[PDB]
Swiss-Prot record, chain A:
The chain holds residues 350 to 399 of 1273 of the full protein. Binds to host ACE2. RBD also interacts with the N-linked glycan on 'Asn-90' of ACE2. Cleavage of S generates a polybasic C-terminal sequence on S1 that binds to host Neuropilin-1 (NRP1) and Neuropilin-2 (NRP2) receptors. Interacts with host integrin alpha-5/beta-1 (ITGA5:ITGB1) and with ACE2 in complex with integrin alpha-5/beta-1 (ITGA5:ITGB1). May interact via cytoplasmic c-terminus with M protein. May interact (via N-terminus) with host bilirubin and biliverdin, thereby preventing antibody binding to the SARS-CoV-2 spike NTD via an allosteric mechanism. Attaches the virion to the cell membrane by interacting with host receptor, initiating the infection. The major receptor is host ACE2. When S2/S2' has been cleaved, binding to the receptor triggers direct fusion at the cell membrane. When S2/S2' has not been cleaved, binding to the receptor results in internalization of the virus by endocytosis using host TFRC and GRM2 and leading to fusion of the virion membrane with the host endosomal membrane. Alternatively, may use NRP1/NRP2 and integrin as entry receptors. It comes from Severe acute respiratory syndrome coronavirus 2 (2019-nCoV). Changing T27A: In strain: Omicron/BA.2, Omicron/BA.2.12.1, Omicron/BA.4, Omicron/BA.5, Omicron/BQ.1.1, Omicron/XBB.1.5, Omicron/EG.5.1. This is Spike protein S1. It comes from the Viruses.
């Protein structure tokens, strides 16, 4: 947590239908957007903090 | 492994999005179609429906 | 000289202009475009916006 990896993800095709067939993903809370309907929006560059 | 669920490790990824005036590069899995002009249709551009 | 007739034209023109410009207000919501709200937000809480 004190060295959280921040990966800049750009020039991608964000397919959010691949993280649900994996292990049970809990607490999928999106602040500002809906959990679904994310496959129709074009973002400029996202950041993944793991 | 024998501790309660409140103390078990949980991996967490935070996906921070951005929306500014620039050509977008991260879209969703939607196959784009051809451009048919001079006809009232439903446009579905990057962020304008 | 012909001001008593141009005044009504200017009044109706500005009444239409302000009526069009009132669509540029959020009225306490997050945006003024409905396609920007229906796309990001789901119907459950999009009603309050």
């Amino acid at each position: 947590v004190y060295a959280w990896n921040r990966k800049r993800i750009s020039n991608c095709v964000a397919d959010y239908s691949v993280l649900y067939n994996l292990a049970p993903f809990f607490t999928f809370k999106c602040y500002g957007v809906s959990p679904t309907k994310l496959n129709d929006l074009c973002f400029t560059n996202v950041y993944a903090d793991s | 492994p024998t501790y309660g669920v409140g103390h078990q490790p949980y991996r967490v990824v935070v996906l921070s999005f951005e929306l500014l005036h620039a050509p977008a590069t991260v879209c969703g899995p939607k196959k784009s179609t051809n451009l048919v002009k001079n006809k009232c249709v439903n446009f579905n551009f990057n962020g304008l429906k | 000289a012909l001001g008593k007739l141009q005044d009504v034209v200017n009044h109706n023109a500005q009444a239409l202009n302000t009526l069009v410009k009132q669509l540029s207000s959020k009225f306490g919501a997050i945006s003024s475009v409905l396609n920007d709200i229906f796309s990001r937000l789901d119907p459950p809480e999009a009603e309050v916006q």
